[PDB]
Curated annotation (Swiss-Prot):
Name of the protein: Uncharacterized solute-binding protein MA_0280
Family: Belongs to the bacterial solute-binding protein 1 family. WtpA subfamily.
Molecular function per GO: molybdate ion binding; tungstate binding
Organism: Methanosarcina acetivorans (strain ATCC 35395 / DSM 2834 / JCM 12185 / C2A)
Disulfide pairings: none
Any single GO BP term: molybdate ion transport
SUPFAM superfamilies listed in its UniProt record: Periplasmic binding protein-like II
Length: 312
Protein backbone atom coordinates (compact mmCIF):
# COMPACT_ATOMS: atom_id res chain seq x y z
CA UNK A 1 0.00 0.00 0.00
CA UNK A 2 1.37 3.45 1.04
CA UNK A 3 4.32 4.03 3.40
CA UNK A 4 4.26 7.47 5.04
CA UNK A 5 7.71 8.53 6.35
CA UNK A 6 8.32 11.80 8.21
CA UNK A 7 12.04 12.48 8.34
CA UNK A 8 14.71 15.08 9.06
CA UNK A 9 16.07 17.26 6.21
CA UNK A 10 19.63 15.89 6.69
CA UNK A 11 18.18 12.41 6.16
CA UNK A 12 16.88 13.25 2.63
CA UNK A 13 19.84 11.76 0.68
CA UNK A 14 20.10 8.41 2.60
CA UNK A 15 16.29 8.07 2.77
CA UNK A 16 16.03 8.51 -1.06
CA UNK A 17 18.42 5.55 -1.50
CA UNK A 18 16.55 3.63 1.21
CA UNK A 19 13.23 4.32 -0.58
CA UNK A 20 14.57 2.94 -3.90
CA UNK A 21 15.86 -0.17 -2.09
CA UNK A 22 12.56 -0.75 -0.22
CA UNK A 23 10.44 -0.29 -3.39
CA UNK A 24 12.70 -2.71 -5.33
CA UNK A 25 11.94 -5.50 -2.82
CA UNK A 26 8.26 -4.47 -2.41
CA UNK A 27 6.53 -3.88 -5.84
CA UNK A 28 3.09 -2.47 -4.85
CA UNK A 29 4.45 -0.10 -2.19
CA UNK A 30 4.55 3.67 -2.75
CA UNK A 31 6.75 5.42 -0.16
CA UNK A 32 5.70 9.05 0.28
CA UNK A 33 8.15 11.11 2.30
CA UNK A 34 7.66 14.47 3.97
CA UNK A 35 11.00 16.10 4.85
CA UNK A 36 10.90 18.82 7.49
CA UNK A 37 12.83 19.94 10.58
CA UNK A 38 12.60 17.13 13.13
CA UNK A 39 10.67 19.04 15.82
CA UNK A 40 8.12 20.03 13.17
CA UNK A 41 8.05 16.41 11.88
CA UNK A 42 7.28 15.28 15.45
CA UNK A 43 4.65 18.07 15.82
CA UNK A 44 2.88 16.76 12.69
CA UNK A 45 2.11 13.57 14.67
CA UNK A 46 1.65 14.95 18.22
CA UNK A 47 -0.24 18.21 17.55
CA UNK A 48 -1.64 18.29 13.98
CA UNK A 49 -3.00 14.73 14.28
CA UNK A 50 -1.20 13.47 11.14
CA UNK A 51 -0.37 9.79 10.87
CA UNK A 52 3.01 8.38 9.85
CA UNK A 53 4.38 4.86 9.58
CA UNK A 54 7.97 5.92 10.16
CA UNK A 55 9.26 8.93 12.09
CA UNK A 56 12.99 9.60 11.90
CA UNK A 57 14.56 12.55 13.73
CA UNK A 58 17.94 14.34 13.78
CA UNK A 59 17.64 14.39 17.59
CA UNK A 60 16.50 11.05 19.08
CA UNK A 61 15.46 12.67 22.40
CA UNK A 62 12.53 14.42 20.68
CA UNK A 63 10.89 10.98 20.60
CA UNK A 64 10.69 10.24 24.38
CA UNK A 65 10.18 13.90 25.39
CA UNK A 66 7.39 14.64 22.86
CA UNK A 67 5.91 11.27 21.77
CA UNK A 68 6.18 8.81 24.72
CA UNK A 69 3.78 7.30 25.69
CA UNK A 70 0.77 8.65 23.71
CA UNK A 71 2.20 8.46 20.17
CA UNK A 72 5.22 6.14 20.61
CA UNK A 73 6.32 3.31 22.92
CA UNK A 74 9.89 2.78 21.67
CA UNK A 75 12.78 4.40 19.76
CA UNK A 76 16.10 3.24 18.30
CA UNK A 77 19.25 5.36 18.03
CA UNK A 78 20.64 4.64 14.55
CA UNK A 79 23.05 7.40 13.37
CA UNK A 80 25.51 10.14 14.39
CA UNK A 81 26.56 13.48 12.87
CA UNK A 82 28.70 16.56 13.51
CA UNK A 83 28.10 20.35 13.31
CA UNK A 84 30.39 22.28 10.97
CA UNK A 85 30.50 25.73 9.41
CA UNK A 86 30.19 25.22 5.66
CA UNK A 87 31.44 27.49 2.83
CA UNK A 88 32.55 27.60 -0.84
CA UNK A 89 35.33 29.27 -2.87
CA UNK A 90 32.89 32.19 -3.44
CA UNK A 91 32.64 32.81 0.34
CA UNK A 92 34.35 35.93 1.74
CA UNK A 93 37.51 35.23 3.81
CA UNK A 94 37.29 31.49 2.95
CA UNK A 95 41.05 31.27 2.29
CA UNK A 96 41.82 32.56 5.79
CA UNK A 97 39.19 30.71 7.87
CA UNK A 98 40.01 27.87 10.31
CA UNK A 99 39.11 26.29 13.70
CA UNK A 100 40.83 29.11 15.67
CA UNK A 101 39.24 32.18 14.02
CA UNK A 102 35.78 31.32 12.52
CA UNK A 103 33.74 33.57 14.86
CA UNK A 104 35.96 36.62 14.24
CA UNK A 105 35.19 36.25 10.52
CA UNK A 106 31.49 35.91 11.42
CA UNK A 107 31.78 39.11 13.53
CA UNK A 108 32.66 41.19 10.42
CA UNK A 109 29.72 43.37 9.15
CA UNK A 110 30.23 42.43 5.46
CA UNK A 111 30.01 38.68 6.32
CA UNK A 112 26.57 37.07 6.09
CA UNK A 113 25.82 33.64 7.60
CA UNK A 114 22.96 31.16 7.74
CA UNK A 115 21.14 28.78 10.06
CA UNK A 116 17.68 27.19 10.21
CA UNK A 117 14.65 27.89 12.42
CA UNK A 118 15.51 26.77 16.02
CA UNK A 119 11.77 26.32 16.78
CA UNK A 120 11.51 23.68 14.05
CA UNK A 121 14.89 22.21 13.30
CA UNK A 122 17.70 20.61 15.39
CA UNK A 123 20.39 22.14 13.12
CA UNK A 124 18.74 25.49 13.88
CA UNK A 125 18.95 25.04 17.63
CA UNK A 126 22.38 23.38 17.42
CA UNK A 127 23.80 26.47 15.65
CA UNK A 128 22.82 28.44 18.76
CA UNK A 129 24.29 25.74 21.06
CA UNK A 130 27.59 25.68 19.15
CA UNK A 131 27.86 29.48 19.17
CA UNK A 132 27.13 29.77 22.89
CA UNK A 133 29.55 26.93 23.83
CA UNK A 134 32.28 28.76 21.87
CA UNK A 135 32.30 31.43 24.63
CA UNK A 136 33.87 29.17 27.27
CA UNK A 137 36.18 27.37 24.81
CA UNK A 138 37.69 30.52 23.28
CA UNK A 139 37.50 32.63 26.51
CA UNK A 140 35.34 35.24 24.78
CA UNK A 141 32.04 35.95 26.57
CA UNK A 142 30.72 38.12 23.70
CA UNK A 143 30.54 35.59 20.78
CA UNK A 144 26.88 34.71 21.34
CA UNK A 145 26.01 38.37 21.95
CA UNK A 146 27.69 39.68 18.78
CA UNK A 147 26.50 36.93 16.44
CA UNK A 148 23.03 36.09 17.70
CA UNK A 149 21.73 38.50 20.39
CA UNK A 150 22.63 41.72 18.52
CA UNK A 151 21.07 40.30 15.32
CA UNK A 152 17.92 38.41 16.42
CA UNK A 153 14.96 38.43 18.83
CA UNK A 154 16.49 35.54 20.81
CA UNK A 155 17.40 36.20 24.44
CA UNK A 156 19.69 34.49 26.95
CA UNK A 157 19.35 33.79 30.66
CA UNK A 158 21.60 31.90 33.03
CA UNK A 159 20.24 29.03 35.09
CA UNK A 160 21.14 28.58 38.78
CA UNK A 161 23.45 25.64 38.07
CA UNK A 162 25.40 27.72 35.47
CA UNK A 163 23.70 26.43 32.28
CA UNK A 164 22.92 29.03 29.59
CA UNK A 165 19.30 29.06 28.42
CA UNK A 166 18.59 30.46 24.97
CA UNK A 167 14.99 31.64 24.53
CA UNK A 168 13.57 31.52 21.02
CA UNK A 169 10.57 33.82 20.42
CA UNK A 170 7.80 33.14 17.82
CA UNK A 171 9.22 32.34 14.37
CA UNK A 172 8.14 35.65 12.82
CA UNK A 173 9.52 37.53 15.89
CA UNK A 174 13.08 36.11 15.52
CA UNK A 175 13.39 39.06 13.07
CA UNK A 176 16.94 38.50 11.81
CA UNK A 177 19.26 41.34 10.77
CA UNK A 178 19.13 40.76 6.99
CA UNK A 179 22.67 42.16 6.49
CA UNK A 180 24.08 39.48 8.81
CA UNK A 181 21.67 36.50 8.88
CA UNK A 182 19.66 34.34 6.48
CA UNK A 183 17.08 32.23 8.31
CA UNK A 184 15.14 29.37 6.67
CA UNK A 185 12.49 26.88 7.85
CA UNK A 186 14.87 23.93 7.40
CA UNK A 187 18.67 23.67 6.93
CA UNK A 188 18.48 22.23 3.39
CA UNK A 189 17.05 25.42 1.79
CA UNK A 190 20.19 27.32 2.80
CA UNK A 191 22.39 25.02 0.70
CA UNK A 192 21.17 26.82 -2.47
CA UNK A 193 22.06 30.16 -0.84
CA UNK A 194 25.63 28.97 -0.11
CA UNK A 195 26.01 27.73 -3.73
CA UNK A 196 25.01 31.11 -5.27
CA UNK A 197 27.11 33.10 -2.75
CA UNK A 198 24.01 34.70 -1.13
CA UNK A 199 25.58 33.76 2.23
CA UNK A 200 29.21 33.16 3.13
CA UNK A 201 28.83 30.67 5.97
CA UNK A 202 26.40 27.99 7.03
CA UNK A 203 25.90 26.06 10.26
CA UNK A 204 24.98 22.56 9.00
CA UNK A 205 25.93 18.92 9.49
CA UNK A 206 29.17 17.37 8.12
CA UNK A 207 27.14 14.76 6.16
CA UNK A 208 25.24 17.50 4.26
CA UNK A 209 28.51 19.38 3.49
CA UNK A 210 29.95 16.17 2.00
CA UNK A 211 26.67 15.70 0.04
CA UNK A 212 27.14 19.11 -1.66
CA UNK A 213 30.96 19.26 -2.00
CA UNK A 214 31.20 22.24 0.34
CA UNK A 215 34.36 23.24 2.18
CA UNK A 216 33.95 23.15 5.97
CA UNK A 217 35.51 24.42 9.19
CA UNK A 218 36.06 21.43 11.50
CA UNK A 219 34.85 22.96 14.75
CA UNK A 220 36.40 21.76 18.09
CA UNK A 221 35.00 18.49 19.61
CA UNK A 222 34.22 20.44 22.81
CA UNK A 223 31.64 22.63 20.98
CA UNK A 224 30.59 20.82 17.74
CA UNK A 225 28.23 18.20 19.32
CA UNK A 226 30.13 15.24 17.74
CA UNK A 227 31.83 13.30 20.56
CA UNK A 228 30.30 11.26 23.42
CA UNK A 229 33.14 12.17 25.84
CA UNK A 230 32.15 15.86 25.69
CA UNK A 231 28.47 15.23 26.71
CA UNK A 232 29.04 16.96 30.09
CA UNK A 233 30.28 20.08 28.27
CA UNK A 234 27.39 20.14 25.74
CA UNK A 235 24.76 19.96 28.53
CA UNK A 236 25.80 23.43 29.76
CA UNK A 237 23.62 25.02 27.06
CA UNK A 238 19.88 24.58 26.59
CA UNK A 239 17.46 26.00 24.04
CA UNK A 240 13.84 26.86 24.76
CA UNK A 241 11.43 26.96 21.83
CA UNK A 242 8.33 29.26 21.74
CA UNK A 243 6.03 26.41 22.95
CA UNK A 244 8.12 25.96 26.16
CA UNK A 245 9.97 22.81 25.06
CA UNK A 246 13.60 22.60 26.15
CA UNK A 247 16.29 20.91 24.15
CA UNK A 248 19.72 20.21 25.64
CA UNK A 249 23.17 20.29 24.06
CA UNK A 250 24.04 16.64 23.54
CA UNK A 251 25.93 14.54 20.97
CA UNK A 252 24.08 14.44 17.61
CA UNK A 253 22.24 11.12 17.67
CA UNK A 254 19.49 10.25 15.16
CA UNK A 255 16.42 8.30 16.26
CA UNK A 256 13.69 6.25 14.59
CA UNK A 257 10.23 5.08 15.69
CA UNK A 258 7.06 3.56 14.29
CA UNK A 259 4.18 5.58 15.81
CA UNK A 260 1.32 3.82 17.68
CA UNK A 261 -1.23 5.32 15.24
CA UNK A 262 0.64 4.07 12.13
CA UNK A 263 -1.62 2.78 9.36
CA UNK A 264 0.89 0.31 7.85
CA UNK A 265 2.83 -0.80 10.97
CA UNK A 266 3.71 -4.24 9.52
CA UNK A 267 5.24 -2.56 6.45
CA UNK A 268 6.83 0.05 8.72
CA UNK A 269 8.60 -2.78 10.61
CA UNK A 270 10.23 -3.89 7.33
CA UNK A 271 11.44 -0.34 6.41
CA UNK A 272 13.07 0.08 9.88
CA UNK A 273 14.49 -3.50 9.60
CA UNK A 274 16.05 -2.45 6.28
CA UNK A 275 17.28 0.75 7.97
CA UNK A 276 18.96 -1.01 10.92
CA UNK A 277 20.20 -3.99 8.87
CA UNK A 278 23.46 -4.19 6.87
CA UNK A 279 21.95 -2.56 3.76
CA UNK A 280 20.87 0.55 5.74
CA UNK A 281 24.28 0.75 7.47
CA UNK A 282 26.07 0.82 4.08
CA UNK A 283 23.81 3.63 2.74
CA UNK A 284 24.68 5.74 5.81
CA UNK A 285 28.48 5.09 5.59
CA UNK A 286 28.41 6.17 1.89
CA UNK A 287 26.73 9.50 2.68
CA UNK A 288 29.21 10.39 5.47
CA UNK A 289 26.74 9.86 8.30
CA UNK A 290 28.22 7.36 10.87
CA UNK A 291 25.71 4.62 11.81
CA UNK A 292 25.32 3.29 15.37
CA UNK A 293 26.03 -0.43 14.88
CA UNK A 294 24.41 -2.08 16.69
CA UNK A 295 21.48 0.33 17.26
CA UNK A 296 20.64 1.40 20.81
CA UNK A 297 16.97 1.10 21.77
CA UNK A 298 14.65 1.92 24.65
CA UNK A 299 11.20 0.42 25.29
CA UNK A 300 12.35 -2.91 23.76
CA UNK A 301 9.39 -4.80 25.32
CA UNK A 302 7.07 -2.64 23.18
CA UNK A 303 9.11 -3.20 19.98
CA UNK A 304 8.10 -5.64 17.21
CA UNK A 305 10.00 -8.99 17.43
CA UNK A 306 11.62 -8.56 13.97
CA UNK A 307 13.26 -5.35 15.24
CA UNK A 308 14.14 -6.78 18.69
CA UNK A 309 16.86 -8.94 17.06
CA UNK A 310 18.57 -5.86 15.53
CA UNK A 311 18.84 -3.69 18.69
CA UNK A 312 20.70 -3.43 22.05
O1 LIG B 1 15.81 17.75 11.48
MO1 LIG B 1 17.10 18.77 10.60
O2 LIG B 1 18.10 17.24 9.67
O3 LIG B 1 18.21 19.45 11.96
O4 LIG B 1 15.88 19.64 9.12
Amino acid sequence: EVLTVFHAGSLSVPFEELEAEFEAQHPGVDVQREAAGSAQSVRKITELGKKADVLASADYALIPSLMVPEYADWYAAFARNQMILAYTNESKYGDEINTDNWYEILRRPDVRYGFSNPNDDPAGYRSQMVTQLAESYYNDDMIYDDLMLANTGMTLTTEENGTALIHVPASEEISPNTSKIMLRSMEVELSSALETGEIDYLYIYRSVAEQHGFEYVALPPAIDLSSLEYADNYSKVQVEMVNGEVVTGSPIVYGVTIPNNAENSELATEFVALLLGETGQQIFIENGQPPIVPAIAEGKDSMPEELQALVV
